Motif scaffolding. Structure first.
Motif, PDB file in Angstrom:
ATOM      1  N   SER A 109       0.066   1.481   5.986  1.00  0.00           N
ATOM      2  CA  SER A 109      -0.336   1.548   4.906  1.00  0.00           C
ATOM      3  C   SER A 109      -2.367   1.764   4.288  1.00  0.00           C
ATOM      4  O   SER A 109      -2.712   1.094   4.743  1.00  0.00           O
ATOM      5  N   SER A 115       4.958   3.305  -0.242  1.00  0.00           N
ATOM      6  CA  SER A 115       6.373   3.264   0.632  1.00  0.00           C
ATOM      7  C   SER A 115       6.266   4.877   0.804  1.00  0.00           C
ATOM      8  O   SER A 115       7.266   4.689   1.988  1.00  0.00           O
ATOM      9  N   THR A 141      -1.247  -7.425   8.075  1.00  0.00           N
ATOM     10  CA  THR A 141      -0.975  -8.989   8.214  1.00  0.00           C
ATOM     11  C   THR A 141      -1.381  -9.506   9.244  1.00  0.00           C
ATOM     12  O   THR A 141      -1.798  -8.518  10.179  1.00  0.00           O
ATOM     13  N   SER A 337      10.934  -1.245   0.954  1.00  0.00           N
ATOM     14  CA  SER A 337      11.524  -1.564  -0.448  1.00  0.00           C
ATOM     15  C   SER A 337      13.079  -1.920  -0.467  1.00  0.00           C
ATOM     16  O   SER A 337      13.587  -0.790   0.096  1.00  0.00           O
ATOM     17  N   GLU A 339      14.673  -1.129  -2.218  1.00  0.00           N
ATOM     18  CA  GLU A 339      14.644   0.742  -2.856  1.00  0.00           C
ATOM     19  C   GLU A 339      14.529   2.238  -1.848  1.00  0.00           C
ATOM     20  O   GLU A 339      15.113   2.024  -1.658  1.00  0.00           O
TER      21      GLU A 339
END
Ligand SMILES: Cc1cc2nc3c(=O)[nH]c(=O)nc-3n(C[C@H](O)[C@H](O)[C@H](O)COP(=O)(O)OP(=O)(O)OC[C@H]3O[C@@H](n4cnc5c(N)ncnc54)[C@H](O)[C@@H]3O)c2cc1C
Length: 353
Positions: A109, A115, A141, A337, A339
């Motif tokens: 990312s 996204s 992370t 996500s 979505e």
């Protein structure tokens, strides 16, 4: 033994780790060296060789204790999977053994590519015996704990490549996200890559396929791990709500005897069961079942956490339910996500006979 061990490793310290925003480095290396956090790695590389269900339920149990720790397992597992899915014989043999001898993170990312993964601009350039990676990743992370940074980027011709970069290679700067809203002890950090030189061998083989496929290969794991992690969150929420419901009394009777509260308990139990079933199905199998598992487990976990918080009321206002509420919200956003999961599952269904 495995879950019992983690129950006591964690053993009432999640609250403090969460409020302080950090996990003990010594614990992660210990679990890493035990092959946990990497359970699915084959025995040939010193891994535990666990199947998806075994590692999944194990991941769920850790999730029920601390989702920051669980997030480290997902990053570890995702990195390991990425290397054994893309790397060659020598690459898998070298990296996998280190990830089960005691830390890695996976960063794809970027500030402008969330996204929309194909929007990343980080570049990897093969040049003789050496590779040069230049770019920036966000919210990686476990990056604050990692020895290895599995970085995604664009080559030059055959765009899309993955490079395992040592956290201490000159030119790399890992800047921790200041105040993360959830999974606060997961060691999130942005990656600043200013002309980082690494061996050509650091670039996994097959780093020539398109942007998708890669990433899609790595996201398969992670989506599976996050899904099981959410089952864990639902477990913690269901158990905390029931514990409060059969002990706390109001209006002359245990909360559990008030039908409205009973209803919340039923919805929490039902959510937990639904998430588990879908996770089990995906673990048996493939790509769509995994997207489905992550999606449902996440949405159900977020709803379950809000329901559990309602049940505990002032007592849950630290707290497993407190953390579940914030942690589950984040799960609805990451690893595709809600979505994006809907657009992908919609595409899948619209292609069925
Ligand atoms: C706790 C945490 C840990 C993370 N760990 C990692 C990690 O280890 N590695 C890594 O690479 N990344 C990691 N990320 C980031 C995760 O990948 C991101 O949540 C995701 O890409 C977020 O993108 P955000 O880019 O700006 O936004 P977007 O700006 O991507 O956010 C867009 C909002 O718009 C919606 N949206 C966007 N496009 C569409 C569309 N076409 N149709 C419908 N809705 C759309 C989204 O669903 C979303 O709600 C982490 C994030 C968090 C919060």
């Amino acid at each position: 033994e495995r879950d019992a061990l983690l129950t006591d490793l964690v053993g009432d310290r999640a609250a403090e780790w969460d409020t302080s925003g950090e996990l003990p480095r010594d614990l992660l290396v210990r679990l890493g060296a035990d092959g946990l956090l990497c359970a699915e790695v084959a025995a040939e590389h010193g891994g535990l060789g666990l199947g998806s269900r075994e590692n999944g339920e194990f991941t769920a149990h850790v999730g029920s204790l601390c989702s920051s720790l669980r997030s480290v397992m997902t990053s570890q597992g995702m990195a390991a999977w990425t290397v054994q899915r893309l790397g060659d014989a020598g690459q898998r043999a070298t990296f996998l053994k280190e990830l089960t001898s005691g830390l890695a993170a996976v960063g794809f990312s970027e500030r402008q590519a969330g996204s929309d993964l194909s929007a990343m601009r980080t570049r990897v350039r093969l040049d003789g015996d050496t590779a040069v990676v230049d770019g920036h990743k966000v919210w990686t992370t476990a990056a604050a704990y990692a020895d290895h940074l599995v970085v995604f980027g664009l080559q030059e011709d055959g765009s899309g490549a993955v490079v395992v970069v040592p956290a201490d290679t000159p030119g790399v700067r890992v800047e921790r996200v200041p105040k993360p809203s959830g999974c606060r002890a997961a060691g999130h950090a942005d990656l600043h890559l200013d002309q980082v030189r690494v061996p050509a061998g650091a670039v996994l083989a097959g780093s020539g396929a398109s942007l998708p496929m890669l990433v899609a290969a790595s996201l398969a794991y992670g989506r599976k791990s996050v899904a099981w992690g959410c089952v864990g969150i639902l477990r913690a929420c269901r158990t905390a709500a029931v514990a409060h419901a059969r002990t706390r009394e109001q209006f002359g009777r245990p909360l559990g005897d008030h039908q409205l509260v009973a209803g919340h308990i039923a919805d929490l139990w039902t959510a937990e069961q639904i998430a588990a079933r879908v996770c089990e199905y995906a673990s048996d199998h493939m790509v769509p079942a995994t997207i489905l598992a992550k999606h449902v487990a996440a949405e159900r976990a977020a709803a379950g956490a809000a329901t559990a918080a309602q049940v505990l009321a002032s007592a849950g206002a630290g707290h497993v339910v407190e953390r579940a509420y914030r942690d589950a919200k984040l799960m609805e956003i990451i690893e595709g996500s809600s979505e994006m999961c809907r657009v992908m599952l919609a595409q899948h269904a619209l292609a069925l006979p």
